[PDB]
Amino acid sequence: LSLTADQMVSALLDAEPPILYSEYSMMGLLTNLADRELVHMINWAKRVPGFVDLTLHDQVHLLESAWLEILMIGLVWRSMEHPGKLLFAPNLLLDRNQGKGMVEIFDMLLATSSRFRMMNLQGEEFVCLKSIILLNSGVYLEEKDHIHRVLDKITDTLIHLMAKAGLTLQQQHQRLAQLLLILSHIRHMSNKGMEHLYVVPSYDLLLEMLDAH
Amino acid sequence: LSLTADQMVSALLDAEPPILYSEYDSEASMMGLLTNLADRELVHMINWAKRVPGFVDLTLHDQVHLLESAWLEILMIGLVWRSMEHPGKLLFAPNLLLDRNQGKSVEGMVEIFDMLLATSSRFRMMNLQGEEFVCLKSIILLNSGVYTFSTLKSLEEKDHIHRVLDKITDTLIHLMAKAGLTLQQQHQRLAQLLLILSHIRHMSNKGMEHLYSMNVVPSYDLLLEMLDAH
Ligand SMILES: CCCN1CC(Oc2ccc([C@@H]3c4[nH]c5ccccc5c4C[C@@H](C)N3CC(C)(C)F)cc2)C1
Numbered sequence: 417l418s419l420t421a422d423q424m425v426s427a428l429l430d431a432e433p434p435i436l437y438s439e440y441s442m443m444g445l446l447t448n449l450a451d452r453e454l455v456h457m458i459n460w461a462k463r464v465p466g467f468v469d470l471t472l473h474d475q476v477h478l479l480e481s482a483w484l485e486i487l488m489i490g491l492v493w494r495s496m497e498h499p500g501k502l503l504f505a506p507n508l509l510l511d512r513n514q515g516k517g518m519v520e521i522f523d524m525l526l527a528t529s530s531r532f533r534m535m536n537l538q539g540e541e542f543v544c545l546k547s548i549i550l551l552n553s554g555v556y557l558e559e560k561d562h563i564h565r566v567l568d569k570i571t572d573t574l575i576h577l578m579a580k581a582g583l584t585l586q587q588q589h590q591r592l593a594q595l596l597l598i599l600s601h602i603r604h605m606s607n608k609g610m611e612h613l614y615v616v617p618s619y620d621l622l623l624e625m626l627d628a629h
Numbered sequence: 630l631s632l633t634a635d636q637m638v639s640a641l642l643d644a645e646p647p648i649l650y651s652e653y654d655s656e657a658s659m660m661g662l663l664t665n666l667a668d669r670e671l672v673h674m675i676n677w678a679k680r681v682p683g684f685v686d687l688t689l690h691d692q693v694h695l696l697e698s699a700w701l702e703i704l705m706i707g708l709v710w711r712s713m714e715h716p717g718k719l720l721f722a723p724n725l726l727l728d729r730n731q732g733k734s735v736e737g738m739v740e741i742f743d744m745l746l747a748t749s750s751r752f753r754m755m756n757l758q759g760e761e762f763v764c765l766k767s768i769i770l771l772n773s774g775v776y777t778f779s780t781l782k783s784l785e786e787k788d789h790i791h792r793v794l795d796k797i798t799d800t801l802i803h804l805m806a807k808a809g810l811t812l813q814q815q816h817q818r819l820a821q822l823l824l825i826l827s828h829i830r831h832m833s834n835k836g837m838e839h840l841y842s843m844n845v846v847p848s849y850d851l852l853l854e855m856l857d858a859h
């Protein structure tokens with residue numbers, strides 16, 4: 417929390433999870449791949465500055481509410497350079513008709529990817545967005561206060577990055593807004609995803625992955 | 630887009646729909662009252678939407694689609710705003726003030742009440758201002774459905790929508806600056822405010838999911854007919 421903006425970025429970049437491969441019907445592959453990415457997400461979350469300062473109870477709650485959103489923005493980020501296609505894994509690249517109630521979700525994921533592409537979303541930016549999702553998704557006294565301080569710190573970092581890129585102050589606030597409004601759509605996709613399922617990772621499973629002290 | 634920030638706020642403040650009342654004269658009545666109230670607010674919402682800058686510049690079908698996507702979000706943020714200075718209560722109408730336990734009377738309603746009450750609590754501890762609220766409501770209208778529209782006309786709509794969003798963002802920053810916030814505090818509050826929209830989306834989806842467990846959404850032509858004036 418005392419880290420500089422530059423230290424925050426580098427920490428988050430270093431904390432980035434690996435790209436996994438699909439173990440190989442299509443629903444089993446997407447399920448299995450999601451299950452394996454979950455473990456690496458948990459270990460990513462532990463390295464997000466300020467996260468392990470929360471109680472384990474609250475860490476689990478945040479992960480319970482954020483896990484699908486984080487899977488999805490990750491999917492969308494690496495699918496950027498592959499228009500009309502979703503790169504779940506290097507050996508699992510699917511289009512919208514391979515989705516044929518998954519096509520609607522595929523479509524939404526595809527639109528979000530094109531949005532990122534259009535915005536020319538940078539790696540240093542995406543990684544901040546992912547941290548914000550983790551901390552923001554489940555927050556609805558000392559703990560909520562801490563979460564909001566970390567969120568504020570990431571906001572600073574995002575603004576710093578845009579300043580470094582040479583964007584004017586007006587462009588900074590405008591780009592910040594565009595990025596955060598995208599999180600609304602990711603939230604929506606996660607909701608529909610959870611709906612199209614009804615499954616979820618239990619409290620105990622997440623707590624186990626967290627590998628307590 | 631020629632509007633200044635001051636002119637943006639003014640237009641949004643004038644576009645504000647009226648505060649409506651529940652009928653004048655029971656837990657078995659609750660859902661009926663909440664449904665009747667929602668239907669009546671919908672009418673004023675369409676009029677409000679038309680007076681949001683840039684909205685009527687859009688095609689009628691894109692206008693319908695934005696409202697199909699955002700109508701429950703808009704209802705809810707209005708409710709949350711009305712309830713801000715009434716801790717533990719949801720002010721659906723000045724004569725319809727409900728709490729948690731009254732929500733219990735309907736299956737799965739207490740969870741939605743809790744989320745709405747928590748959002749009201751968030752607005753409270755942020756000391757959300759009226760000028761900020763109408764900006765946030767406008768953003769919901771323009772942003773919620775824009776990612777679920779490739780035709781050339783549609784590409785032009787999206788660019789227009791994103792440019793109006795940019796302007797509302799400029800308006801939000803302006804308001805926070807006049808209030809005397811530092812630059813750092815301005816971006817920080819802008820972020821905090823926009824993050825709440827994620828949760829409002831969340832609530833709309835949970836609530837939409839309730840409704841299908843029991844006319845539940847406005848039909849295309851219903852919204853069309855109200856939007857498609859002569
Ligand atoms: C027991 C632990 C919980 N796991 C069961 C498993 O349930 C899922 C089943 C399918 C999906 C897919 C999926 N898989 C991914 C792998 C890497 C990155 C993105 C994804 C997604 C997003 C999306 C296609 N998911 C389908 C869904 C949930 C209906 F939207 C996500 C979760 C998560």
Ligand SMILES: CCCN1CC(Oc2ccc([C@@H]3c4[nH]c5ccccc5c4C[C@@H](C)N3CC(C)(C)F)cc2)C1
Pocket residue numbers: 660663664666667668670701704705707708721741835836837839840844845846847848
């Ligand atoms: C054209 C058909 C669509 N209308 C039928 C009507 O269905 C509803 C029935 C109940 C609700 C309530 C409700 N009512 C309000 C009145 C003014 C402002 C806010 C509200 C809300 C939010 C919330 C409590 N709604 C319940 C629910 C299930 C979450 F949608 C929302 C919609 C909307």
